[PDB]
Design a protein around this nucleic acid. Structure first.
Ligand SMILES: [Zn+2]
Ligand SMILES: [Zn+2]
Length: 373
RNA sequence: UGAUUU
């Protein structure tokens, strides 16, 4: 078992180093817990290790490089076969480790690697974004640690003495910010079936209530709105879960959460979202509050369909429009733009669904009527 | 807590 393959770390070492607050000073060591398995995930791993290394000053002693040196020797001592490796790392890799690991994976197709990260290190710096993309392109699967992964790491690698994992405050909030940020910098694209199913604007017939939201940012420069290529991406609502958001978190709120995290300066910005459902009353109230607090940020909301929340949704849309948000129903040009920009389309052009224009006209008339009452 | 990279 893993407990006999590693010396489990002190619980305080784990809790302090794997806390997932995205902005965290004082944590000058990187920790890496790993499992080496066969192609078959069943059974215990072949081996498991804990590595650590100081962030500064020598990247050669970061735990990713210690892992590489260990793994080379270990493979010499065991009969060769394909390996699936999993890492739980407290900080995501620096540019040097990202490139070294990418080189290693690109030269060795017998090894595949999954990296779960507690926090993103310098996620806002383009050299780090680029190096994480290089690592992804070499085949590494990179994900943010969520509750299940912290619990698994606790059970396997920590001297918990039979006590269960206890989540810290704001674990889910931190997770959602980091997962959106990682999707941004890896340039994740939406599945085309997912897009077409969720943005079709005919009367909704599925029992599912889910909201997908694409977003982008423009900056005002010499009276012209210019693109800001950094903060562009998509997200969806978080369904309720007692270990996540117990009452869920709607897509509009996750979107709003991202804007302060971007640390926009004092210039004028226009933030646009393309959401498959118009916001419910709660979401519209929160967006109105945001507008009240961020004068330099102009909000533009394009919706595929109008969501009747069985409540005060019309009042929410009216309040948003009155407070200066642009609210409009998506037309052909917005659907095509989202297909071209946010969707994993693999060179294929946008193919409109039947009735797109007719549905857009009827929805736009309904939105006009709501805004005029 | 925007967080010393040779
Ligand atoms: Zn490193
Ligand atoms: Zn809502």
């Amino acid at each position: 078992q893993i407990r006999n393959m590693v010396e489990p770390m002190d619980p305080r070492t784990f809790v302090s180093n794997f806390n997932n607050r995205p902005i965290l000073s004082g944590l000058d060591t990187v920790w890496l817990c790993c499992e080496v398995k066969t192609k078959d995930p069943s059974g215990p791993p072949l081996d498991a290790k804990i590595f650590q290394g100081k962030v500064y000053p020598k990247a050669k002693y970061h735990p990713e490089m210690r892992f590489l040196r260990w793994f080379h020797k270990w493979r010499q001592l065991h009969h060769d076969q394909e390996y699936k490796v999993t890492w739980y790392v407290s900080w995501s890799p620096c540019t040097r480790c990202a490139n070294s690991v990418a080189t290693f994976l690109a030269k060795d197709p017998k090894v595949t690697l999954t990296i779960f990260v507690a926090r993103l290190y310098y996620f806002w710096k383009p050299d780090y974004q680029q190096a994480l993309r290089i690592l992804a392109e070499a085949g590494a699967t990179m994900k943010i640690m969520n509750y299940n992964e912290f619990q698994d790491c606790w059970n396997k690698f920590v001297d918990g003495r039979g006590k269960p994992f206890k989540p810290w405050n704001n674990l889910p909030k931190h997770y959602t910010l980091l997962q959106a940020t990682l999707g941004e910098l890896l340039r994740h694209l939406m599945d085309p079936g997912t897009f077409t199913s969720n943005f079709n604007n005919k009367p909704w017939v599925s029992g599912q209530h889910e909201t997908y939201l694409c977003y982008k940012v423009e900056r005002l420069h010499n009276d012209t709105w210019v693109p800001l290529n950094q903060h562009r991406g998509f997200l969806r609502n978080q369904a309720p879960n007692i270990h996540g958001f117990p009452k869920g978190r709607h897509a509009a709120l996750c979107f709003l959460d991202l804007i302060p995290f971007w640390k926009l300066d004092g210039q004028q910005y226009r933030v646009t979202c393309f959401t498959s459902w118009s916001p419910c009353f709660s979401c519209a109230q929160e967006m109105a509050k945001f507008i009240s607090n961020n004068e330099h940020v102009s909000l533009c909301i394009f919706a595929a369909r109008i969501y009747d929340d069985q409540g005060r949704y019309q009042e929410g849309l009216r309040t948003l429009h009155r407070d200066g948000a642009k609210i409009a129903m998506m037309n052909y040009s917005e659907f095509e733009y989202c297909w071209d920009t946010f969707v994993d389309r693999q060179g294929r052009p946008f193919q409109p669904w039947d009735g797109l224009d007719e549905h857009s006209q009827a929805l736009s008339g309904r939105l006009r009527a709501i805004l005029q009452n």
